[PDB]
Design a protein around this ligand. Structure first.
Ligand SMILES: Cc1ccc(-c2ccn(CC(=O)O)n2)cc1
Length: 209
């Protein structure tokens, strides 16, 4: 049972700008997704300070980067707070309508796409490199869900029957054909060292057979 939703017009406009603007510095998508994971991990950590049972769904707070050249996917996994179904539908837990408004004003007033995270909509930078994004998520207060979008104005949400996650979020980037450098170990390591050196959770880059 799959539900299909229209993006709000402002979010569809954001996504088309990300996909269509000529902008070479695409590697910042990974910094933005790692930053979102860190924020989600901070949230569950804070809740656990007054209620240890919040970690019954998993005590480890970490970020995993999983490249898969056969599937042409890069997956970013975190064990943060996760998202409810309502969060997924409401722009993956963001205030994306107001954030987009500000971001697009900044772009006309000098800024560039790399600054997207300052507007709370850094998730959508995934579309710099991915033709399709799948988000699998599990929040303590809800069931496990899969969100997916290839842009084009719509997204889907369904209950996820796949491998149970415990708690957190998995962002699966189905990479564009010309963006496979982001599956190479040395390239990922370079990006993490350049942009994510001060993230306060372990970031493990998985290797492939
Ligand atoms: C990730 C990203 C990439 C591009 C933009 C952006 C902003 C304004 N434009 C179009 C223009 O050049 O006027 N494109 C925003 C975010």
């Amino acid at each position: 049972e799959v539900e299909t939703f229209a993006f709000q017009a402002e979010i569809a406009q954001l996504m088309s700008l990300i996909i269509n603007t000529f902008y070479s510095n695409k590697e910042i998508f990974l910094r933005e997704l790692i930053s979102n994971s860190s924020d989600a991990l901070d949230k569950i950590r804070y809740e656990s300070l007054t209620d240890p049972s919040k970690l019954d769904s998993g005590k480890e707070l970490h970020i995993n980067l999983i490249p898969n050249k056969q599937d042409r996917t890069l997956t970013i996994v975190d064990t943060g707070i996760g998202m409810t179904k309502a969060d997924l539908i409401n722009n993956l837990g963001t205030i994306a309508k107001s954030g987009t408004k500000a971001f697009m004003e900044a772009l006309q007033a000098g800024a560039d796409i790399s600054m997207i995270g300052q507007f709370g909509v850094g998730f959508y930078s995934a579309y710099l490199v991915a033709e399709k994004v799948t988000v699998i998520t599990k929040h303590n207060d809800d069931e496990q869900y899969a969100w997916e979008s290839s842009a084009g104005g719509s997204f889907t949400v369904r209950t996820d029957t796949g491998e149970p996650m415990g708690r957190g979020t998995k962002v699966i980037l189905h990479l564009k054909e010309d963006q496979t450098e982001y599956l190479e170990e040395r390239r990922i390591k370079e990006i993490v060292k350049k942009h994510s050196q001060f993230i306060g959770y372990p970031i493990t880059l998985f290797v492939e057979k």
